[PDB]
Write a protein that binds this ligand. Structure first.
Ligand SMILES: CCCCCCCCCCCCCCCC(=O)O
Ligand SMILES: CCCCCCCCCCCCCCCC(=O)O
Ligand SMILES: [Fe+3]
Ligand SMILES: [Fe+3]
Ligand SMILES: [Mn+3]
Ligand SMILES: [Mn+3]
Lengths: 291, 291
């Protein structure tokens, strides 16, 4: 009762022109190893930051690494959904995606080790109601709903949560924050490289999510309503996450950052996700999903 | 009800000395891209083979690619089991493992495309009762049993099936067969490279499986009885798979292969798996699993 054929033995083999398999090939060509990045200069720069600056960097790094860990775990029901859909190229892509998230977890962990952020860091994520809502609750709920029901609507809700909010709104805003922190000051060249490489990977993750939502919208435009509903539900939580300040928080945010600017940037990113997905409305599904 | 902390934010971070994380690092250092292998000479060699030789090579290649596809899908419940055990380093490793199997599927598919094996090839696996029993039935049954019950005993049964039989008995015998086919004749240099690279990856897969079984045996030596029972159940099926001949089968196996020699080699590989796992009997678990 488990398997009756193999996609890889069908006539015509695997469709290398499919979006997931093109992304798989790009990810192989662009592979990078966290172990090759030297963090010694970052450790020196870390010592020159003020305490308030270290706290803000630790908070951003903690939000990132916990998020990379979360997606590493929470993507897995999508792999099983693609197995149920019979979509083996998408399943293959998701294996690379998931591994890439484990590798992102690794790289942040190595950076933290290098600068000495080796105590318990949960206070930087667990006290933020927006972060908790997304990464402790909404992300795993939406992705695990695919186990009992891998319907197009649930796939779109899961992809909006994972690819269009967690990645395509929050991670992108985080990369912008890192750029503001590091470029203004010429600090943390290792982290600058991390951000470049993880961002390269993220563009493929986001392309997969855009493809997933587009093909479902093309097949049944009711799924566009689902995309908008899920985004309207989640975006306020993402904005809350960005605007949160700890009890210990300085009146002046370090690095001359404007947290409300970050929130506005995030809203713009979310709008771009919606716009990309909206382009599939009225397109025949076979022109998006060659399969 | 889904997540309450993050392994990556705990004091002491991730334990890079753990076996799974050492393997993860090795896999990153040894990454290879299927797209970098030139199969043009293999295509020329393919044209010089007899029909009977092509049929035998197609059979071996089909058994491999379908097996790579099977493990790509069927490993995934182990990732969820490690999430349940709270074993995040093992989960990270399994993401690389799973991706590597997708990449093995890719490389065989590219080789098949290059030589022109692009029709339906199910006749080469679906008619073999040993192959069917393992790859259609026993592998997915044993691995999916971890969803409702990720107990040590079920983990050992799943790892014996996946790592010690599918990989550590059958794949290793298949690599030996490829070596016999290609080295005796100086043919298929692309496939020779494929076999070297996939074999390198397999040694890490098998090391993970050896570790998994060892730590469970060390914790509860009743799991040694489970290892032996599962191996005694599966090895006859693996031998049947190797000895199978199609209806169309020549009286003389091509390439001067002796199928019963391959079966004996497989039995020796299985014995080596058991011997490796048996070394954990009586070892305190903390000396295997530093965690
Ligand atoms: C100092 C103020 C910082 C404000 C916070 C900016 C938003 C950071 C969000 C990080 C979430 C990380 C998600 C990772 C997901 C992925 O890797 O695929
Ligand atoms: C011409 C006779 C050939 C005899 C068959 C030899 C055995 C081949 C078995 C191949 C199984 C492949 C399993 C792959 C698993 C993995 O990649 O992890
Ligand atoms: Fe991502
Ligand atoms: Fe393997
Ligand atoms: Mn990431
Ligand atoms: Mn393999």
């Amino acid at each position: 009762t488990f398997r009756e054929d193999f996609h890889s033995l069908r006539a015509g083999g695997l469709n290398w022109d499919s979006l997931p398999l093109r992304l798989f090939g790009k990810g192989n060509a662009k592979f990078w190893d966290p172990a090759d990045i030297d963090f010694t200069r970052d450790a020196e720069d870390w010592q020159g930051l003020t305490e308030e600056e270290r706290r803000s960097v630790a908070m951003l790094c903690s939000q990132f690494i916990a998020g990379e860990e979360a997606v590493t775990q929470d993507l897995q029901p999508f792999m099983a959904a693609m197995a149920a859909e019979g979509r083996f190229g998408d399943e293959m892509y998701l294996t690379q995606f998931c591994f890439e998230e484990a590798k992102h977890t690794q790289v942040f962990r190595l950076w933290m080790d290098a600068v000495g952020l080796t105590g318990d860091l949960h206070s930087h994520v667990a006290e933020n109601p927006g972060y908790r809502a997304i990464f402790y609750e909404e992300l795993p709920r939406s992705l695990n709903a695919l186990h009992d029901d891998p319907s197009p609507a649930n796939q779109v809700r899961a992809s909006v949560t994972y690819n269009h909010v967690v990645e395509g709104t929050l991670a992108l805003t985080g990369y912008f924050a890192w750029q503001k922190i590091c470029r203004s000051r010429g600090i943390l060249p290792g982290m600058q490289e991390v951000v470049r490489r993880i961002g390269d990977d993220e563009r493929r993750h986001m392309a997969w999510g855009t493809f997933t939502c587009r093909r479902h919208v093309a097949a049944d435009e009711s799924n566009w309503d689902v995309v908008q509903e899920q985004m309207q539900h989640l975006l306020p939580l993402a904005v809350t996450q960005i605007q949160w300040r700890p009890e210990d928080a300085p009146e002046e945010t370090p690095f001359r950052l404007d947290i409300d600017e970050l929130a506005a940037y995030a809203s713009d990113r979310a709008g771009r996700r919606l716009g990309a997905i909206s382009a599939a409305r009225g397109v025949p599904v076979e022109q998006i999903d060659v399969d």
